[PDB]
Amino acid sequence: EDAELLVTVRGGRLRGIRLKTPGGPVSAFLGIPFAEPPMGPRRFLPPEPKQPWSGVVDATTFQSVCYQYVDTLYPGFEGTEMWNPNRELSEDCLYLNVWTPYPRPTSPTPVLVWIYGGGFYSGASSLDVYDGRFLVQAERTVLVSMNYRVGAFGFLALPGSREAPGNVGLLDQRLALQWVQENVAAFGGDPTSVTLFGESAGAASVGMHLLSPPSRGLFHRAVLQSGAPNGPWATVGMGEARRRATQLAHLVGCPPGGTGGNDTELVACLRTRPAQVLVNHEWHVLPQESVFRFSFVPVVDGDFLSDTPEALINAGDFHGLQVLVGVVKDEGSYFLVYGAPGFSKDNESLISRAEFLAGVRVGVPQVSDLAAEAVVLHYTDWLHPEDPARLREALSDVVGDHNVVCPVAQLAGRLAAQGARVYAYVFEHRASTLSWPLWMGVPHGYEIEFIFGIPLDPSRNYTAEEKIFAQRLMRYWANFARTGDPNEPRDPKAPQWPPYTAGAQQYVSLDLRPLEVRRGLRAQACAFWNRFLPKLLSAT
Amino acid sequence: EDAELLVTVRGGRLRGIRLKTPGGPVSAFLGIPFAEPPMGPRRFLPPEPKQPWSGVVDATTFQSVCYQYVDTLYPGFEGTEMWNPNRELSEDCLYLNVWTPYPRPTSPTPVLVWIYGGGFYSGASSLDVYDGRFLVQAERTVLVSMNYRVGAFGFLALPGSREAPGNVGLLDQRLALQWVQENVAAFGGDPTSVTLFGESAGAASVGMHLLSPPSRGLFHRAVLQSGAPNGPWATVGMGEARRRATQLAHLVGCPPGGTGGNDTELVACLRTRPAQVLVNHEWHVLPQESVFRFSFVPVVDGDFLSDTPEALINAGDFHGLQVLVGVVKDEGSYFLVYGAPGFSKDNESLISRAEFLAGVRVGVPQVSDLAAEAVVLHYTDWLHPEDPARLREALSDVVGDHNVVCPVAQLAGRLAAQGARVYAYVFEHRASTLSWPLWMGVPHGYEIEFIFGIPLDPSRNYTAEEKIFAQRLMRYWANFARTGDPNEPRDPKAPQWPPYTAGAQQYVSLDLRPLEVRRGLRAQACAFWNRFLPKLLSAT
Ligand SMILES: O=C(/C=N/O)NCCN1CCCCCC1
Ligand SMILES: O=C(/C=N/O)NCCN1CCCCCC1
Secondary structure, X not given: OOHHHEEEOOOOEEEOEEEEEOOEEEEEEEEEEOEOOOOHHHOOOOOOEOOOOOOEEEOEOOOOEOOOOOOOOOOOOHHHHOOOOOXXXXXXXXXXXXXXXXXXXXXXXXXXXXXXXXXXXXXXXXXXXXXXXXXHHHHOOEEEEEOOOOOHHHHOOOOOOOOOOOOHHHHHHHHHHHHHHHHHHHHOEEEEEXXXXXXXXXXXXXXXXXXXXXXXXXXXXXXXXXXXXXXXXXXXXXXXXXXXXXXXXHHOOOOOOOOOOOHHHHHHHHOOOOHHHHHOOHHHOOOOOOOOOOOOOOEOOOOOOOOOHHHHHHOOOOOOEEEEEEEEOOOOHHHHHHOOOOOOOOOOOOOOHHHHHHHHHHHOOOOOHXXXXXXXXXXXXXXXXXXXXXXXXXXXXXXXHHHHHHHHHHHHHHHXXXXXXXXXXXXXXXXXXXXXXXXXXXXXXXXXXXXXXXXHOOOOOOOHHXXXXXXXXXXXXHHHHHHXXXXXXXOOOOOOOOOEOOOOOEEEEEOOOOOOEEEOOXXXXXXXHHHHHHHHHHOO | OOHHHEEEOOOOEEEOEEEEXXXXXXXXXXXXXXXXXXXXXXXXXXXXXXXXXXXXXEXXXXXXXXXXXXXXXXXXXXXXXXXXXXXXXXXXXXXXXXXXEOOOOOOOEEEEEEEOOOOOOOOOOOOHHHOOHHHHHHHOOEEEEEOOOOOHHHHOOOOOOOOOOOOHHHHHHHHHHHHHHHHHHHHOEEEEEEEEEEEOHHHHHHHHHHOOHHXXXXXXXXXXXXXXXOOOOOOEOHHHHHHHHHHHHHHOOOOOOOOOOOHHHHHHHHHOOOHHHHHOOHHHOOOOOOOOOOOOOOEOOOOXXXXXXXXXXXXXXXXXOXXXXXXXXXXXXXXXXXXXXXOOOOOOOOOOHHHHHHHHHHHOOOOOHHHHHHHHHHHOOOXXXXXXXXXXXXXXXXXXXXXHHHHHHHXXXXXXXXXXXXXXXXXXXXXXXXXXXXXXXXXXXXXXXXXXOHHHOOOOOOOHHHHHHHHHHHHHHHHHHHHOOOOOOOOOOOOOOOOEOOOOOEEEEEOOOOOOEEEOOOHHHHHHHHHHHHHHHHOO
């Protein structure tokens, strides 16, 4: 028995497992309970710390996935099932994982903490694409990842009430960060050098931890990949959250007709239902037909977020803060086969103009007809207003800029102009083993496998260039975790990555070619979303 | 005694004059009266045909310029003096000029008819830049140019009244075209092949003759240079025309204190005033501070224009029509020193961001604050929003696209898609002798000297390539006048000028280099002015 696979934390003793990489072994501790199981009367309630245990808890395999919707549109398809749960579903899912270098670092090592995405309705830390054995081996970093409640179990909010306050999924993440502060030293990690990084909804969660004072003291750096807390999908108002929670109760027979009314009777009725029943009606509470819109998301209630994310970003003071942000080349292409007319992943999706005009109302839901015409004006090539290929790329840009690129650019500009050191990138490499159609280019979420060094897996069919490219990316992320600067501290041969400023707006392109400096994260398109359209919506 | 300088027309006999060109002599008949002098009780009235005369009218020099405002901002400056009157001012100004080749053509020759511009408030056919001796000698065509009343004397309108019906300046042009149909054969001209061409307000006049049935049968081809009848400056409503006419009457003491102010007594009071007194208050009736806006323009009253030029262009049948339209490279740069803050012709006019935002309200007058925001959104380089050089060219584009380029492109597209054969150009050569500052580029109106072959003047310091360039353009304009096709019908080696279509939107660039085919007359910018902005103004 290896002595390094046995670690004592504040709650008790753990037994880890040993993972193999082509470059050496890594010690992993998968399935550490950091909270009491939020079951029965604890559903919709904030998490409670895990009570100390007797004996040796087995931490050799991933624990259960939180209850969530499962994508079944394309059975057996790799592009969709890689995000589906790989463990059985259960409300007893609040567990975290710790990948530590081996031999265990004798000196405090910076810590990376991963928060998965999934529109706040799905995701799991046990996915193969989030395997941190290659990143920990190649860069000798301590990597931590947790599970948090998604869907109604994590973000159903009846504002004002104590039985369903909302944002408990964000509190699950906060408790996992407190666990890192109190226990990551036992694994060789430095609790004074904690870097959060997440993608999509995980990136939005990272941004909300920066804007929440109680969470701000639990970390020191932030990485937001293809997401931001100020996105049109990341938050919801108190009134809309109450309507969505009330309809979900109605769809499952709550309250029993006709007795019931207040939130105490409504949540009590919701707690008597099998968790699967609540999942089966989640997508039936959205207000309209749309893409990139989710039912139960963080609510702006004044507690976890004293104001809207946009308000907190503008009024924020971010001195002494290092942030790394970026997007992929084709942020919106993936979402078009989930609602936009004329689109299919199994053909070329060469839509007509009538389908393009209809798709704008799906990609930009709940806006006036005049606002839709302003969108069509900006995203139409009026020399080729009928070309199906250009219209396909246009609608992809409409969804990507509205939901990802411009919310991130707005955040990156305000952060750098208010004391924060910011670095920006654009991921432009399409994996050679990508199963999605070619017209989608570099879809949303397909830089993650290169950040985690998945091409180093010998059982996979990546090329030799993608292996070297993956190692260069892991260097960038690890250097930012250690020094707050993605550049090599001393290497002068490698081209440099300049910070992102509100004026120069410099970023770099990440692909097989060396670094290339560019200016402006779609300055022309994002000026429409961030500056003009809000004024157009004010004057209805 | 040259017998070719004596010609008899329907009204009487004339004596012409021989003009010298480096390639040969030309016969000219300058100062032919085509209408009774609109003086005294004839002020503001439609023109009457010139009564027949006894003897030989002398036609050896230009007649008087119609009463008009004189630009005196820069005394002695060639850039402004070249457009000022070069003969004495008088209301007795309705005279036309005929240049005919020598020896006089024994065969019917196609006729070019020039209509000068000047915002309908100025201009004259006697200007040196409109000299037709070079175009007539080089291409052996017949050129005719007329004078028409400008300002209040030609376009003061009290709609519904009979003393000042309006558009009488347009009727002066129509009468001159009826004169060409009845007398151009005496000069060797073909009345069955008449091609109109004009610039700025003259181009807008040619467009209004296309949309007026009584004028349409007097010509067969049209050329519109840097102007169109659907421009925001070329027409005015009945209510606004009445307000401007009433305000001008008030400024000159009409009606007297205690006198009724009906249309009969108001115009009667205006007729007793000296012509210069009316000119001295012309610029004091415009609604607000602006550029490219003129006080007395053609009125839409249902007579000369049965509907707005936009309505007539859309619902028009143009089969059997060849049009040649085009613009210069920097249409709006010249108007900026006439009202835009921070601009001066004697410095670099490196305006600030605040001066750019203020100039937008001067260049686009009477639009909502939201409409101005959309203009700033489209014409701001959000990667360099404060660069003074880019702001200068941006405001130049705002004035040029809003007043010239986009009104012309909209007309060229509707004509081609409704039966007319259309050719489009963009003039991109800046004259070597241009006195305006360099930052203005190719200003409004500075292709005329090349169309009329002015570089061939030995007394002027043009370069040898501009001389050959002027001969190319005179060949283009003559070929279009003869055959309706500017391309050489005998040389397939030379680059071809493809017709302008609503789909391909092809045009050619006119400079010292050979023809270059391009697509789209600022399609992105003109989609804002022609499509989105009207929808914004309706929703206010
Ligand atoms: O977020 C959505 C939107 N579906 O319409 N689907 C889940 C797919 N994503 C794709 C990559 C982001 C990480 C979670 C998995
Ligand atoms: O048309 C204007 C507008 N002034 O603000 N000014 C007269 C100058 N133009 C020069 C170019 C068009 C030919 C007529 C005379």
